RNA sequence: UCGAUGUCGGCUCAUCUCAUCCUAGGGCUGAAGCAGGUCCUAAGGGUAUGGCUGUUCGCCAUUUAAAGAGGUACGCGAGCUGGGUUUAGAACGUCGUGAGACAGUUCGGUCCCUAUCUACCGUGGGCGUUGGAAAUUUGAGAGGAUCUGCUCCUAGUACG
RNA sequence: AACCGCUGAAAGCAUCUAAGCGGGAAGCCCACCUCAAGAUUAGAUUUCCCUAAAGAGCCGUUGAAGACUACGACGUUGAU
């Protein structure tokens, strides 16, 4: 008797829809990261991607508690001297509303080639309409 | 790895790992985590029965 | 107005007001006595 | 105390609450505000009472502010709000035509100001300006904006000042 | 905001009746044949595509030949595009003509061109670096770049550092240039200013955004 | 760190902080006006040439809107110089009997390295972009730029 | 941003703030100029071609283009 791996050829990725309207950013991102990593499956092995395809709608309506809408700052560096740029949660959700949840899930997910694959799996769409009618995903509440 | 897989199975059956192991220990079930993970991975119904015993002991 | 760590009323006319988690002293009688904490 | 104080309604004025929005109809005009969730509105003939959903130090304040808003709206719609501005100086004169008022001041270019909706400005004489509004908030904001262009000065008193208000005086030399 | 494509013929001068020199450049303007109209529905943005000049069939590929035949225009020596809006797409349909009468005398224009290429040049020329002393013991550093960083901290050259590079042969735009004269019959436009590039090159003339 | 981490100053080239020199927005004023004084916000740009001295500094002259305070191995010599300091010669004052010595002075006195890696400035080859190709392009994003005097007019009006 | 507010209670008054609504800097993000899909999230549009096709390259004459490259033009149906 040996402990077996998931044999990537045999793993199937299911499609789920998550409505981000009115949910807490971090508390939703933790669950999305867990689903993307595949921690809910009994065949989970750290080196195989066994997670699901998470489609998120109403990404701009994600909520943060306290004064974090006006005080949570996102920094980045351009690589040039003094090239440190800072934006707000509110301005970021106005400009690129996906990037908030994308960044939150990225920070939670592991770093590496396999983490890049799982973050590739993630699908985020603003608004109540998504171009995944063909996939026929399943509504999920979490 | 065994603990992760057992947690996954217990949560599929409606229970967490820290309660499932406690229920095992209260039921006096001596199955090791290696065998428990094997059962969770390759036989869902037997693991469901184990979770039922644990939940009846809790 | 005077910016200082210690702000206290200088007369009865002076009034203490808190805005944006900051301490301000405003008196109608005198403009100079007005103070802010910071 | 203010929250406890019940608002008195004239016979003509009528107030309705639906979908958490308060609407007041009177002869002068119609005024609408948004009710706070902690606060609750009760209508009994000839009177209106405001009470909080939950009893707390946080909610008492909100119910009080809502009561003050509603009392101000009731009396304003019944009679309206009037404010007076005075211009002091040889070269200062104000002329109001229609909804736009032009004020002449020290600056070379004559300042032109457009009043917001629900505000009417009349000038029986150039020196003094009269502003009449349905509601006190708009009246005060418009008066403050008009005052902003040419605030008073303490050496000679020149500028735009409210009749009620008093200007501090300073002596040169 | 749609413009036109011309050829720089060189610089000359215009005398004013008051006796004032006006240095001008003459741009040859062959009729710009509209080859494609772009819109929000099909393309997502609004623009006018034009061709100018002439190209022989041996040099016109089958794909470009079909692209031109769709519009019904004769192949030119290049295809250009102008960002346009609803006002500017009013009367411009595929196969139409844009002439020098797009621009009227006395208005400001912006001219874009490919500046003369100086090749690989040093800091002294390209970045206007101050030259080091010719004498007083100088050895091999008359035109040297000099220090490029400070020390261990940071210990790296910062990005955007000014160093010897290729100079010229880049897109350059000049703004606020008047238009002295327009000739539809000769298809020539006369523009105040340097109008960057060399003579015989292709220059883009557009209305000034500043106005 | 002594089987070696090159000193001060100058030149060239910079990068960052704000405890802001000018510009920009304000409160108070013993703010009549013009000019200021103090403090708050603000680092986007700009923030001199010469005589003396090896000088950093400092004094001076003449300007400027202003001639800011600092960190970066008191930035920067495998980028340059080598005037001072700090070898070997010689001399003055002083100390020592003497050889010699002086954060005392004076004249003179070899500054190496063809760049492997990182970094940076340019410019190409390869493949990829769900058949291939010729063109036109949207823009996630990145960089550049951001300075300011004087004259006239308002008006010799407001103020005095 | 500092600062100045309107209305307004906690705190019958007062109060720029707790709800709500304003003004406000060479500063922040756009707007201006340049680059930009190796943006592996590799996008979009119009044409052309598929039993060595459409095209690309080599080669040759070469350019206000260039270190070599690359880029631009032309090669008898031609002014390179």
């Amino acid at each position: 008797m040996k402990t077996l791996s998931a044999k990537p050829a045999e793993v199937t990725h299911d499609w789920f829809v998550v409505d981000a309207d009115g949910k807490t950013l971090g508390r939703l991102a933790t669950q999305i990261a867990s689903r993307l990593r595949g921690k809910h499956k009994t065949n989970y092995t750290p080196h195989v991607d066994t997670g699901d395809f998470i489609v998120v709608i109403n990404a701009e309506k994600i909520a943060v508690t306290g004064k974090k809408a006006q005080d949570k700052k996102y920094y980045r560096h351009s690589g040039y001297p003094g090239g440190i740029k800072e934006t707000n949660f509110t301005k970021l959700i106005a400009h690129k509303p996906e990037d908030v949840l994308h960044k939150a899930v990225k920070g939670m997910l592991p770093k590496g080639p396999l983490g890049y694959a799982m973050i590739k799996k993630l699908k985020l769409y603003a608004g109540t309409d998504h171009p995944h009618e063909a996939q026929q995903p399943k509504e999920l509440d979490i | 790895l065994w603990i992760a897989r057992i947690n996954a199975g217990a949560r599929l059956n409606g229970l967490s790992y820290s309660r499932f192991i406690n229920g095992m220990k209260k039921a006096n079930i001596t199955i090791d985590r290696r065998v428990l993970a094997d059962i969770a991975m390759h036989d869902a119904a037997t693991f469901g029965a184990l979770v039922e015993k644990a939940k009846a002991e809790l | 107005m005077k910016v200082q760590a210690s702000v206290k009323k200088i007369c009865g006319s002076c009034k203490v007001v808190r805005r944006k988690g900051r301490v301000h002293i405003i008196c109608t009688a005198e403009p100079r006595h007005k103070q802010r904490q910071g | 105390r203010v929250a406890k104080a019940p608002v008195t309604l004239p016979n003509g004025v009528s107030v309705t609450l639906n979908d958490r929005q308060v609407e007041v109809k009177g002869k002068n005009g119609n005024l609408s505000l948004r009710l706070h969730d902690l606060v609750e509105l009760k209508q009994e003939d000839d009177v209106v009472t405001l009470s909080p959903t939950v009893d707390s130090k946080e909610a008492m304040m909100h119910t009080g502010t809502i009561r003050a808003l509603l009392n101000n709206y009731v009396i304003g719609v019944t009679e309206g709000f009037e404010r007076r501005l005075q211009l002091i100086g040889v070269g200062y004169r104000a002329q109001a035509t229609g909804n736009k008022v032009t004020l002449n001041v020290g600056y070379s270019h004559p300042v032109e100001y457009t009043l917001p909706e629900g505000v009417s400005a009349e000038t029986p004489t150039q020196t003094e300006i009269v502003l009449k509004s349905n509601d006190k908030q708009q009246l005060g904001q418009a008066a403050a904006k008009i005052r902003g262009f040419r605030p008073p000065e303490p050496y000679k008193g020149k500028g735009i000042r409210y009749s009620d208000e008093h200007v501090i005086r300073k002596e040169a030399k | 905001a749609i413009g036109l494509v011309g050829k720089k013929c060189g610089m000359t001068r215009v005398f004013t009746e008051a006796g004032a020199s006006i240095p001008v450049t003459v741009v040859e303007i062959s009729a710009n044949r509209i080859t494609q109209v772009k819109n929000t529905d099909v393309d997502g943005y609004q623009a006018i595509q034009v061709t100018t000049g002439t190209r022989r069939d041996s040099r016109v590929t089958a794909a470009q030949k079909g692209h031109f035949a769709k519009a019904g225009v004769a192949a030119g020596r290049g295809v250009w595009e102008f960002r346009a809006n609803d006002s500017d797409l009013e009367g411009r349909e595929i196969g139409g003509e844009i002439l020098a009468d797009l621009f009227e005398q006395g208005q400001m224009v912006d001219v874009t061109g490919n500046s003369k290429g100086k090749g690989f040049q040093g800091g002294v020329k390209r970045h206007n670096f101050s030259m080091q002393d010719a004498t007083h013991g100088n050895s091999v550093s008359h035109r040297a770049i000099g220090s490029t960083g400070q020390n261990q901290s940071p210990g790296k050259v910062f990005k955007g550092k000014k160093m010897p590079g290729q100079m010229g042969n880049k897109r350059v735009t000049v703004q606020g240039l008047e238009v002295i004269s327009v000739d539809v019959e000769k298809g020539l436009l006369v523009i105040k200013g340097a109008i960057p590039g060399a003579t015989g090159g292709d220059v883009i003339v557009r209305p000034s955004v500043k106005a």
Side-chain angles (χ1 to χ4, degrees), chain A residues 1-85 87-142, chain B residues 1-31 33-58, chain C, chain D, chain E:
Chain A
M1 181 195 48
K2 304 182 81 183
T3 305
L4 309 180
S5 302
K7 186 179 289 293
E10 301 306 80
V11 305
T12 52
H13 302 287
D14 295 316
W15 284 71
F16 299 97
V17 185
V18 176
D19 189 358
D21 183 18
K23 312 211 166 137
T24 304
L25 166 70
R27 293 181 184 271
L28 183 64
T30 52
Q31 283 134 10
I32 294 158
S34 288
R35 284 331 181 101
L36 293 171
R37 194 151 191 251
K39 284 192 91 43
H40 56 300
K41 274 152 141 43
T42 63
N43 44 307
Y44 154 80
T45 187
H47 64 100
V48 176
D49 193 355
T50 67
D52 303 348
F53 278 95
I54 305 306
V55 170
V56 168
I57 64 156
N58 293 299
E60 65 183 1
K61 291 168 159 142
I62 193 66
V64 298
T65 290
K67 304 152 161 293
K68 291 174 71 175
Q70 43 174 340
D71 288 34
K72 166 173 201 66
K73 314 222 201 163
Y74 299 80
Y75 297 90
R76 70 194 186 283
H77 208 270
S78 78
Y80 290 78
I84 193 66
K85 317 277 202 274
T87 198
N88 290 318
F89 169 91
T90 300
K91 304 183 321 213
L92 181 56
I93 62 170
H95 182 27
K96 291 174 71 175
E98 292 95 0
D99 272 15
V100 163
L101 204 49
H102 195 270
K103 275 222 201 153
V105 163
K106 176 176 60 181
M108 281 165 208
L109 297 169
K111 299 82 186 176
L114 179 75
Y116 304 139
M118 305 172 187
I119 198 54
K120 282 179 47 188
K121 274 163 31 203
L122 183 49
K123 258 58 170 179
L124 318 164
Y125 281 81
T128 66
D129 186 74
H130 49 107
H132 292 316
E133 296 302 320
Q135 293 303 0
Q136 293 313 0
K138 294 163 292 181
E139 181 56 298
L140 180 63
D141 54 345
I142 193 66
Chain B
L1 172 69
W2 307 328
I3 288 161
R5 291 195 173 148
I6 295 155
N7 211 345
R11 280 163 194 294
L12 271 43
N13 296 122
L15 183 62
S16 64
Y17 174 94
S18 50
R19 314 191 61 51
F20 172 77
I21 286 298
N22 187 223
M24 291 295 78
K25 182 173 72 68
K26 293 182 183 293
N28 293 282
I29 298 156
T30 300
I31 297 169
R33 277 152 197 81
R34 194 171 91 131
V35 190
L36 288 162
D38 199 78
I39 296 150
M41 179 156 180
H42 307 125
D43 171 347
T46 307
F47 202 79
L50 274 177
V51 171
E52 294 294 328
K53 264 192 161 83
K55 184 212 291 213
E57 281 326 290
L58 294 174
Chain C
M1 65 180 288
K2 325 169 188 313
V3 181
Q4 43 187 3
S6 179
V7 296
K8 58 191 59 181
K9 314 152 91 153
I10 302 173
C11 65
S13 75
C14 278
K15 194 212 191 83
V16 176
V17 298
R18 285 170 42 91
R19 304 181 201 141
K20 300 294 187 291
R22 274 211 211 101
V23 175
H24 281 77
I25 309 301
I26 58 184
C27 65
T28 63
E30 198 74 356
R32 49 168 68 184
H33 284 147
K34 182 174 73 175
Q35 293 179 356
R36 188 269 298 164
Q37 189 179 31
Chain D
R1 264 191 201 71
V2 177
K4 274 162 221 163
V7 162
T8 302
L9 303 178
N11 182 352
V13 188
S14 298
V15 73
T16 62
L17 182 62
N18 64 34
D19 190 10
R20 251 180 50 84
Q21 186 75 24
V22 182
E23 191 256 0
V24 185
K25 65 178 72 66
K27 67 184 289 184
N28 290 18
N30 177 354
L31 271 183
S32 179
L33 61 83
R34 182 179 63 83
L35 191 83
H36 210 270
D37 50 14
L38 295 174
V39 192
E40 215 175 9
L41 199 152
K42 294 172 321 313
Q43 188 275 331
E44 190 276 331
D45 55 345
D46 182 65
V47 65
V48 176
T49 56
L50 277 296
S51 186
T53 47
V54 71
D55 182 359
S56 59
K57 186 180 289 293
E58 182 65 26
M60 212 65 97
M61 182 179 72
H62 286 92
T63 187
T65 189
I66 301 299
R67 184 269 169 179
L69 294 174
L70 186 71
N71 170 23
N72 277 327
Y73 283 10
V74 168
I75 62 170
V77 296
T78 302
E79 65 183 1
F81 282 107
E82 191 216 330
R83 210 171 200 186
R84 293 181 184 271
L85 300 81
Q86 184 178 2
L87 279 60
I88 297 169
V90 298
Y92 292 166
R93 64 201 181 51
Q95 186 62 23
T97 61
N99 64 347
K100 296 183 289 294
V101 60
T102 184
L103 313 157
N104 290 318
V105 288
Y107 323 117
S108 301
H109 65 66
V111 298
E112 189 277 331
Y113 179 54
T114 180
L115 312 162
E117 294 294 328
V119 173
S120 61
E122 281 96 320
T123 61
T125 189
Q126 60 188 13
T127 187
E128 184 178 1
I129 310 177
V130 175
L131 300 172
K132 292 170 176 175
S133 164
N134 208 347
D135 62 358
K136 197 175 188 177
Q137 203 294 300
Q138 273 303 10
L139 182 78
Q141 192 60 24
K145 284 143 151 183
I146 293 182
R147 194 211 201 241
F149 302 117
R150 180 84 291 180
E153 183 178 1
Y155 291 115
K156 294 253 281 193
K158 309 183 57 184
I160 307 176
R161 72 168 71 164
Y162 314 122
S163 58
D164 171 28
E165 86 170 359
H166 42 62
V167 177
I168 301 299
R169 294 291 331 251
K170 283 188 168 300
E171 201 266 359
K173 299 167 173 293
Chain E
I2 68 184
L4 61 83
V5 184
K7 194 163 271 293
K8 185 174 177 176
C9 319
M11 284 197 66
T12 175
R13 64 181 293 165
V14 175
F15 283 118
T16 312
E17 293 82 3
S21 68
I22 301 171
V24 294
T25 312
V26 185
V27 298
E28 193 181 29
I29 279 179
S30 174
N32 290 318
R33 281 82 65 193
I34 300 169
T35 312
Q36 183 74 110
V37 176
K38 293 182 183 293
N39 44 47
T40 61
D41 273 18
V42 191
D43 299 318
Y45 73 104
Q46 293 144 310
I48 297 277
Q49 173 154 270
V50 311
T51 198
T52 300
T54 187
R55 200 81 186 274
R56 69 200 66 196
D57 51 335
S58 67
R59 298 288 172 180
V60 174
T61 71
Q64 295 297 109
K65 194 182 321 303
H67 172 74
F68 290 128
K70 183 178 184 293
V73 302
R77 73 196 190 239
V79 188
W80 278 270
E81 183 178 1
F82 294 116
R83 179 66 178 86
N85 63 7
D86 291 331
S87 66
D88 289 345
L89 301 183
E90 181 46 2
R92 323 287 200 171
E93 69 275 16
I94 190 167
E97 301 275 309
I98 303 182
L99 308 171
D101 64 9
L102 189 57
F103 288 88
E104 69 275 16
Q105 179 167 332
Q107 65 182 357
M108 297 317 175
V109 286
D110 303 348
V111 185
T112 299
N114 304 317
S115 66
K116 285 166 139 187
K118 317 301 173 92
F120 182 76
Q121 299 293 337
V124 162
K125 184 189 183 59
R126 195 170 91 131
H127 295 303
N128 297 115
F129 276 22
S130 179
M131 201 155 158
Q132 273 154 100
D133 213 318
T135 64
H136 290 258
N138 193 317
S139 303
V140 296
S141 51
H142 314 284
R143 306 182 67 104
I145 48 154
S147 178
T148 61
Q150 293 84 80
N151 210 309
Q152 177 178 193
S153 66
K156 54 142 161 173
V157 181
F158 286 103
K159 281 194 170 303
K161 175 68 175 76
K162 284 202 211 93
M163 291 188 75
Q166 151 73 33
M167 186 187 132
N169 189 359
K170 294 302 181 113
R171 184 201 201 71
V172 182
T173 291
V174 179
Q175 313 154 220
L177 291 193
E178 201 186 30
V179 55
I180 296 311
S181 69
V182 177
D183 192 351
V184 65
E185 288 80 14
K186 294 202 241 163
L188 61 80
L189 182 62
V190 169
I191 307 284
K192 183 68 180 294
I195 296 88
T199 81
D202 291 331
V203 298
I204 301 299
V205 183
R206 290 195 330 297
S208 184
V209 298
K210 314 322 261 183

